[PDB]
Design an enzyme around this catalytic site. Sequence first.
Site, PDB file in Angstrom:
ATOM      1  N   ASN A   1     -10.529  -0.787   3.658  1.00 34.77           N
ATOM      2  CA  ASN A   1     -10.147  -1.070   2.127  1.00 34.77           C
ATOM      3  C   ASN A   1     -11.481  -0.840   1.479  1.00 34.77           C
ATOM      4  OD1 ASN A   1      -7.853  -2.006   1.442  1.00 34.77           O
ATOM      5  ND2 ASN A   1      -7.742  -3.873   2.408  1.00 34.77           N
TER       6      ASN A   1
ATOM      7  N   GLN B   1     -21.692 -17.739   0.198  1.00 31.32           N
ATOM      8  CA  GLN B   1     -21.781 -16.414  -0.194  1.00 31.32           C
ATOM      9  C   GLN B   1     -21.106 -15.979  -1.613  1.00 31.32           C
ATOM     10  OE1 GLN B   1     -20.417 -13.613   2.956  1.00 31.32           O
ATOM     11  NE2 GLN B   1     -21.995 -14.103   4.208  1.00 31.32           N
TER      12      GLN B   1
ATOM     13  N   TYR C   1     -14.882   0.258   3.426  1.00 34.75           N
ATOM     14  CA  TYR C   1     -15.442  -0.437   4.250  1.00 34.75           C
ATOM     15  C   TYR C   1     -14.530  -0.677   5.368  1.00 34.75           C
ATOM     16  CZ  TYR C   1     -18.938  -2.089   0.432  1.00 34.75           C
ATOM     17  OH  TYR C   1     -19.502  -1.966  -0.617  1.00 34.75           O
TER      18      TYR C   1
ATOM     19  N   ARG D   1     -15.168  -3.798 -10.530  1.00 30.82           N
ATOM     20  CA  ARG D   1     -14.788  -3.004  -9.141  1.00 30.82           C
ATOM     21  C   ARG D   1     -13.549  -3.463  -8.979  1.00 30.82           C
ATOM     22  NH1 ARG D   1     -19.917  -2.251  -5.184  1.00 30.82           N
ATOM     23  NH2 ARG D   1     -21.442  -1.666  -7.174  1.00 30.82           N
TER      24      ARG D   1
ATOM     25  N   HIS E   1     -27.383  -7.559   4.266  1.00 38.42           N
ATOM     26  CA  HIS E   1     -28.297  -6.482   4.685  1.00 38.42           C
ATOM     27  C   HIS E   1     -29.806  -6.840   4.708  1.00 38.42           C
ATOM     28  CE1 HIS E   1     -25.302  -4.912   1.326  1.00 38.42           C
ATOM     29  NE2 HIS E   1     -24.564  -4.473   2.292  1.00 38.42           N
TER      30      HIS E   1
ATOM     31  N   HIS F   1     -14.002 -15.795  -2.450  1.00 38.81           N
ATOM     32  CA  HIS F   1     -14.981 -14.578  -2.359  1.00 38.81           C
ATOM     33  C   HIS F   1     -14.448 -13.354  -2.703  1.00 38.81           C
ATOM     34  CE1 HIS F   1     -18.624 -12.891   0.375  1.00 38.81           C
ATOM     35  NE2 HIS F   1     -18.509 -12.809  -0.851  1.00 38.81           N
TER      36      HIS F   1
ATOM     37  N   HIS G   1       0.812  -1.269  -0.109  1.00 37.14           N
ATOM     38  CA  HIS G   1       0.102  -0.198   0.137  1.00 37.14           C
ATOM     39  C   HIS G   1       0.848   1.303  -0.030  1.00 37.14           C
ATOM     40  CE1 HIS G   1      -4.021  -1.180   1.180  1.00 37.14           C
ATOM     41  NE2 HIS G   1      -3.470  -2.158   1.580  1.00 37.14           N
TER      42      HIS G   1
ATOM     43  N   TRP H   1     -22.240  -9.747   6.133  1.00 39.79           N
ATOM     44  CA  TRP H   1     -23.208  -9.679   7.024  1.00 39.79           C
ATOM     45  C   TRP H   1     -24.418  -9.174   5.952  1.00 39.79           C
ATOM     46  CZ3 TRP H   1     -22.373  -7.159  12.196  1.00 39.79           C
ATOM     47  CH2 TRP H   1     -21.464  -7.430  12.951  1.00 39.79           C
TER      48      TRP H   1
ATOM     49  N   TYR I   1       0.821  -2.715  13.076  1.00 41.80           N
ATOM     50  CA  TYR I   1       0.833  -1.311  12.194  1.00 41.80           C
ATOM     51  C   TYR I   1       1.757  -0.664  13.099  1.00 41.80           C
ATOM     52  CZ  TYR I   1      -2.755  -2.368   8.840  1.00 41.80           C
ATOM     53  OH  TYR I   1      -3.280  -2.962   7.747  1.00 41.80           O
TER      54      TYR I   1
END
Lengths: 498, 498, 498, 498
Positions: free
Chosen positions: A145, A439, A212, A200, A302, A191, A72, A300, A355
């Site tokens: 992210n 999922q 998010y 995206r 919606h 996933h 990053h 989760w 971090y």
Amino acid sequence: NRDPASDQMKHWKEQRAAQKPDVLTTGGGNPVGDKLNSLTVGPRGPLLVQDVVFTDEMAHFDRERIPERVVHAKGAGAFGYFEVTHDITRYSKAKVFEHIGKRTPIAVRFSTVAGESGSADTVRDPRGFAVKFYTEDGNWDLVGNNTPIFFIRDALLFPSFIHSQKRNPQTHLKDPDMVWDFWSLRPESLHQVSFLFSDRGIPDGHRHMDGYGSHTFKLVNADGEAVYCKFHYKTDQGIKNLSVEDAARLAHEDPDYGLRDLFNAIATGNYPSWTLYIQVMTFSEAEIFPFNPFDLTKVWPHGDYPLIPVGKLVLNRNPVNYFAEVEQLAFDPSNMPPGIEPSPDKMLQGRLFAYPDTHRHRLGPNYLQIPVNCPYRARVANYQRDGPMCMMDNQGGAPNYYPNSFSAPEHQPSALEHRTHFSGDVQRFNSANDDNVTQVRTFYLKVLNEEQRKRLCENIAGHLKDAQLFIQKKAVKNFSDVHPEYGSRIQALLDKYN
Amino acid sequence: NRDPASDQMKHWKEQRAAQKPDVLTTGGGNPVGDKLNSLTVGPRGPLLVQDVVFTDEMAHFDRERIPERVVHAKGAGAFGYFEVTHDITRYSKAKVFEHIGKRTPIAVRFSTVAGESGSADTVRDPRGFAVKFYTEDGNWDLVGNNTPIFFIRDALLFPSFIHSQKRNPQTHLKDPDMVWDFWSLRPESLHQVSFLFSDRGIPDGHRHMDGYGSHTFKLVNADGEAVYCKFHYKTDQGIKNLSVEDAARLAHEDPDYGLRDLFNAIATGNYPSWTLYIQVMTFSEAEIFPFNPFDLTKVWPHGDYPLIPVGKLVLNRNPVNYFAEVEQLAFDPSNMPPGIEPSPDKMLQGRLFAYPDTHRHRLGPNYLQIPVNCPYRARVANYQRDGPMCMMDNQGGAPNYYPNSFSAPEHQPSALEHRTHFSGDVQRFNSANDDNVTQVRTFYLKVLNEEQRKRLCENIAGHLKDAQLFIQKKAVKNFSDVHPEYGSRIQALLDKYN
Amino acid sequence: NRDPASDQMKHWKEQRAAQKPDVLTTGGGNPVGDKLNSLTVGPRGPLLVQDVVFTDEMAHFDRERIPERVVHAKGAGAFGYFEVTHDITRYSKAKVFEHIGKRTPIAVRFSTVAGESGSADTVRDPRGFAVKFYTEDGNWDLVGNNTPIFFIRDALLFPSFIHSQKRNPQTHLKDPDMVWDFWSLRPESLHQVSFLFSDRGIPDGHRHMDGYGSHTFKLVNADGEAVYCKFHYKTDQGIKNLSVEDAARLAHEDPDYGLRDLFNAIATGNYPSWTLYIQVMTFSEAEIFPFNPFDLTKVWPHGDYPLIPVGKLVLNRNPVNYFAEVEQLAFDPSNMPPGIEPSPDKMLQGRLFAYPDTHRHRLGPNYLQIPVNCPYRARVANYQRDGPMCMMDNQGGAPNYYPNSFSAPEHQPSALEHRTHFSGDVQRFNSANDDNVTQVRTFYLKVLNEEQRKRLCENIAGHLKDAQLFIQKKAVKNFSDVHPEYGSRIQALLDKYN
Amino acid sequence: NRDPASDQMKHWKEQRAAQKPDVLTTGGGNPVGDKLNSLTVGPRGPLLVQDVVFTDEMAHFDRERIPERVVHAKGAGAFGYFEVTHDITRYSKAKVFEHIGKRTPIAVRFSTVAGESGSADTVRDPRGFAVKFYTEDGNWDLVGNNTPIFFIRDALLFPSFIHSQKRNPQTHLKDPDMVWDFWSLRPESLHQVSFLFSDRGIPDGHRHMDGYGSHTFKLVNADGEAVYCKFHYKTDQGIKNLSVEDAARLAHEDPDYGLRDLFNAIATGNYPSWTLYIQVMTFSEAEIFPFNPFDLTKVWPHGDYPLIPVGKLVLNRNPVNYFAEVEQLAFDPSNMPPGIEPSPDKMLQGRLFAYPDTHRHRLGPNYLQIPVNCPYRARVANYQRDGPMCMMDNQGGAPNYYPNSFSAPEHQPSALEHRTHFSGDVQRFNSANDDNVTQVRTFYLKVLNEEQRKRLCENIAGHLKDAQLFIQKKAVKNFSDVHPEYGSRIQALLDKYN
Ligand code: HEM
């Protein structure tokens, strides 16, 4: 004329009519007579060690670079404010959220994930979207992210993950055997690989992607009452992605496309905002969610966990100095002020450590005194002292041991963490066989159309195609496992490449 | 009661009636609930990685220590002012000296030379006496010793010098074979060895020793007119030395004797001052001085070069924080503002390089932004950017290249160095056979009495006695060379030890 | 199958039939039981601080990155040998050249100049071509470029130069105002700007460009006899450049094009060689050369100073580890073994200092003990000790001071530098008005055709076109100054863009 | 003659008849002509930047010092072997213990705790006694003290502890208000304060003190069967302490007394040994021990938990280089090879983190490749790469991600940690009110005579006497609490001082 990014020195200058340039000094503050010609004996003689203007300046040059971020590495930043617009005080006692209309200052770095500092902005890669809040209860960093999930559920697999996304130890090239070796061997990764090779995969600049929190936090209200949560900050600008043809062009045409765009928006008064929402999950629904609620390869739903508005995120100030306010910004997940608190999320628990660990390496022991990383809206008082490049007054002559009879700072009980109960064997629990496809399956059947499914396949294979056939073989089985057409739309293409 | 050094926390406290201790935070500014008890599962369970209060604090502890100074490691500091009291504007155009009655702020570190950080103050060793001036033409550091000379005339022999004064590479002990091997093998060292083993070998604290610039500077007036100079800052308190019996006691009784004393003086209002003088030597007298005018083992005789008063040095403020204002102070010889300038002194020419070299190592690339090392009375404007722990605004968005069309800082001709002429072969000239005894001889015959001569001998042998006899042999020959009684007063004693 | 770069892990593996993987350890050498699953309390509990396998591994990850090179950040490396093929012992007493047929080991890093670590290989930029020789008289590094000249004649202007080639301090974008502000303001820069925007601006990979020493060295034979020289190492592969259309494609298609190519050549047995030549200039021809012989914006014409062959440079071994043998390679100009020696070249004299200066920052105090940077073909004996990450035995218990009575290493007179005479005023001599166009003029009239002249113009303007018109204006005047058609072929194009 | 410490260079030399000193080089391996005289223009001219021999050497000097240890800064080291002499394979499956007569290599650093690097050896302070074992299952470090207990039961209070033992933030002096403020405010500290001010407060050198593991480990046999343990390594030389009068003399007379002694023993063939014992406590006796079995202010009574012999620790080799083999030794508690394992001991759990944390700061990211810190008796294979001063081959071209299809190292199940069960609330449990006196009481009544009790009182008050009376007051109450005569023997003395 041209875009403001471009008229920069032009404006820096225009802005000083109260000119007459400053006197050019050394770093000791001694004024310089000639900075265009070194000191020698005779016009064609050798260089004197007495040209302490040469060595001052050169000595500083040779020292300009700090290690880049382990991941990053490449990014953009900017400042603005978070403003409350609904109250969630039921859920959280955090000051940042304490009262509708409240505004807290925030900083934000956008970035990609695998490319090193001179890479191209417009590449398929996840996208960092970090927010630092300067609250009164100290800084609260929300290192998110632009994706609600990730590739893995155990921090222990992260070094490896990242190693395989980077370059070969021998070759220094990007290696599809490593990309596809890993991923196919760890299908919990399906996933997000599915999110990544879809439209995206590449946003049109930073302003047109969502942010998010990904992980599950824990929110604690003023009564000791806890609930689990998920943060979503949606773009007010909309979603907009660049076709892969568009992205190739720009990767060469303007490696820095996203910096230029972010700069220019804000500069021209076009301030990006994002609406921050929270999904909430009680401790009981957590005991019944048909999956591990704390599993980063999981969202989760919606319909089950509808989103609740919290406030807005507006970006309205560009950096004066990139190095000092974007390269030196340090976001720590562990910077959670009373009322926000981590969950048992394995991936989150390792970010707690990592971090600040690398911040002490890259920036230094005391990187929290870097103006931009300073909780300036709060008051730091503790028993930590000394250390390299110690900037402040080092807290003067105040007692440095705890406890003491001499009125030095004291701890405050109202900041105790939330009591929670854990029972079990100290062991290392597998998580590789948690559900890797459901999922995923839905995502591919009901979240994405047919165009998109045709696209997410071509993009996938378009890269996959360069691993060794074994790797392909395994890759496709996994895909086959999530939906049989996912698998064989891909084999079809791979066959034709191969 | 007791001495102020001792009533410190007592006063820190007394000074806050406007109490109610601050809230104890982490470095992110997050408030702490319990800092006396780590976070565990069950009262006898293991330590959670989520105790990000433990790791914050511990992480900072484990990082408190920076390398100590390669030499002069142990010391004391303090702040005060230099005040002009006579004018030497004929000689120098330097702002610090610009007008009688002028006051510039100064900092000062006293130190010994060979002992590491926990050593005893009261040991026979030269003594550092450094003065940093915050002038308008930037800082001007005058890194002096309490001796007008030194052991060597070539910087190249310094590492070695120092190595032999320190400890054995194998043993970690102090070794007289190394002390006396070096010194006897390099007799240019006799001048100062003679100063060192005399009564001034050990001052009674810092307040009762003189400070000298040692090296020969060059002073340049407002016309381009240059002269050579020597700085002497004499104690207004007098000379006072501790007998060697007194010094042994205190080395154990109070290793920090000198810090305590300096603290206590200033604290009780007893402010040490020193009068600053300059000897001046025209370029012509320099062409005729019967010795190398630029030879650190040499003084300029005061009947020949009488001292001229310049101003006063008053110490009137103790540090609030030692670490931050004495351990982190960085004095660079090379910090000479327009009107002061180095001479061809071989020892000086290497100090030009060394000080900033080790400051970038010990403190960091940017150690000049450490509050105390900042030329705060001036305005830094240049083309240096970036680098680790870059604290300021990094000079904003101002053009970073030179020259430029955009009004960024400019060089100022009036700060050009002084034109001087040098002709010769680029070669490495011996200096070991320059005169090693004359000045020494006089020193011992006319500068020191008989008591003193009896003393300087006993002290010498008292240490010499532990080298191997060869080393003794050579040591004494050298002494014999400076005066035959110097030599045989010493052999006499050595015989009786041996 | 595919190219060897690509079959790497495939071969690493194939190469171990004597398999049975090693046991996965921590860095303390303790064997690991599960490295895929962190240690928790209960399968959905928190992360134990006792997972000292997690922190070991993570702690190492967070610390992988060292600062990249201040310039020339991105590159490729490889090993091979220099072989003598003619003798120049008349000229030089250097061991490397001591006898026809002699072979010395060498390492080589190719690189670009301004791009950071993730940039594209195939960009118009000068190109680094560094050669490290492991001779018996220590290492001899020849830090060359693929150009015989450069942009500037005074090191003092280098920071600035480079600053303006990099990115805006505010924007982090590449800025043509800065590129073209500098260059137009400093026309000594025309010579090389002319080389850079021609067909050689972008080589087809590293194997098809020449390497030059650029600077003027001084060669000293076994009698004390000196001469000035220039090193040229020409490609045995030929010159081959990529059209700018070809380069855009590859910058996106394969950012690492040059690494891949260099890897693949050598891997498949196609070993690049270069023939090393020297031009020689006596001290007298130097007193008469119609220009400053030591001026980096100047070449020595080959009709006047014909090239003399010296030996060959063959590249025949790829790195096993990039990080350890290419990222950590440190080339210092100052690494000249007896018989080679710097000239009064202002640009060279500052490189003497800079390289080791930044090596001590980037790599560390002791970066010369990094296996690849170790003069392994020689024997290091000196009085330097200690320092961070001190790897060897630190030279044991051997006397650490010089001189000494105990047989520690001694200096060797036959290695004294060459006596040379300099007379002059210690001043800062302008060099901006040295001749900025002649050589340039010829270059453009007689060295380059018409196609090429049409091309070098389009390329120039193609970039120039984005500065502000003032900057254009000045840029073109300068061009006009070197040849009136150079100027107005350019204005023509600029008009049509603008 | 003299003691071997002293005849060191004498022997280094004597040992080379195969002399003819090596050639003195630069660090690039280039031979030096004159290292006693810098390069100038004319014998009284200025210093050339071309004296790249000066800067090489000086540059290395200015960089010699690394931060000293945050605690335990001053010490001695040496090498030898651990030999099994009884078997405890019932208890432990660790290779080091695998079979009577087995010998593993070990290193050992002795040290004090609060003094900085130049302090005196012979001061009242606990004493470090660290043992590094180079086993086949990697290194196993046993970082013990010469005391079976400590001052505190929670790592969180350690920074503070240590801060108060060091020096005032303002004054830089040692402050009894801080010593006695802390201790009196935290009486869990009475147990060890009682050990410290007794005759064992100051050992006669390192050879005459015991070493203890202090903490409770966990031993796991080849069946999965665990037990708790305590390590005791008793001196074969006996106990011998220096009177406080003896210690004052030597602190001035020979600050390094303990280094000299350790050197000299071993040198003359007088090898110190210690017998290693283990106390064992089953998991059940642990559920019933009337105290927290894991509480560092507590010993396990030997009538209850008799000692069991394990093997011997013999010291038989002195360092060749102190810097490289004693200053750079890094002991990590967390270096436990399969069969040894930490307990829930709060103090132990924080040492898990701290040691490697500060090793990465002091020494560097890769301090485990420092020859002496290398698990050389084992084979390191993992997925960690890169990082500053990376010495080895960086593990070549071997797959750097896990898992992989390419035969890179694999984890080994037989090294899984031992399954244990924990149930409770994630909270911060007080421990300040655990029993602070019992064991203390006995210690003072039955472990120490009357002479000793009279002594331990005088010593205590002899220091206590300098805090403020409040502090005294509280100090004595606490003492009073452990035994009423402890308290009032002390008040009596304090009254007479005061
Ligand atoms: C070639 C000659 C010398 C060299 C290369 C040299 C080098 C050094 C170095 C590397 C330091 C440590 C500074 C720091 O780490 O911040 C130092 C400290 C110091 N040196 Fe020198 N030294 C030389 C001779 C002298 C002489 C002749 C004097 C007296 C005029 C002197 C006075 C001092 C003082 C006072 C300090 C301590 C500064 C402080 O208190 O911060 N040195 N020197």
